Structure 1
């Protein structure tokens, strides 16, 4: 029962990692938007 805490903790770290990856990929997408559109 106490050892079952890992099942309730292992998704959270992957959640944080995926959030970091999402932030990175969105920041990367901003670069393509800047490089493609003419803008001012």
Structure 2
């Protein structure tokens, strides 16, 4: 009787452990997304500085203009 059960239990332990692994494997896949982002984040900071640098030039012109 017990044989099939000792066996079915050793199935699950192995399978669960397979999944544990699948999941650890999935986290690295994530950390690596998070860190490929950085270059993106950077470029955003560049667009922002660039918006400011323009807008500042308009302001500088609006005053120059009236002459």
TM-score (norm 2): 0.47
TM-score (norm 1): 0.71
* Runs of 4+ displaced beyond 4 Å: none
Residue segments in structure 2 that go unaligned for 5+ positions in a row: 1-27
List per-residue Cα deviations over 1:1-40 (Å, max 9, x = no partner).
Answer: 745442x21110001111011001111000111011127x
Larger Rg: 2
The structure carrying a bigger helix percent of its residues is: 2
SS in structure 2 of the partner of residue 11 of structure 1 = helix
Tell me the number of residue pairs that the alignment of Structure 1 and Structure 2 aligns.
38
Q: CA RMSD for the aligned pairs?
A: 1.8
Residue segments in structure 1 that go unaligned for 5+ positions in a row: none
